[PDB]
Design a protein that fits this description.
The protein has 33 residues and is mainly α. Helices cover 58% and strands 0% of the residues. The protein is built from one helix and no strands. It starts with 6 loop residues before the first helix and ends in an 8-residue tail after the last helix. It is found in: Cell membrane; Basolateral cell membrane. Belongs to the anion exchanger (TC 2.A.31) family. This is Band 3 anion transport protein.
Length: 33
């Protein structure tokens, strides 16, 4: 009865860590955030 909890949750973590993954590596020398 809780489908949206397993699929829609993993998808939210797929693009949340994917997008911020690179943006964190590149740059980040002078300004931290």
């Amino acid at each position: 009865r809780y489908p949206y909890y397993l699929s829609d949750i993993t998808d939210v973590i797929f693009i949340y860590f994917a997008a911020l993954s690179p943006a964190i590596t590149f740059g980040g020398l002078l300004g931290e955030k």
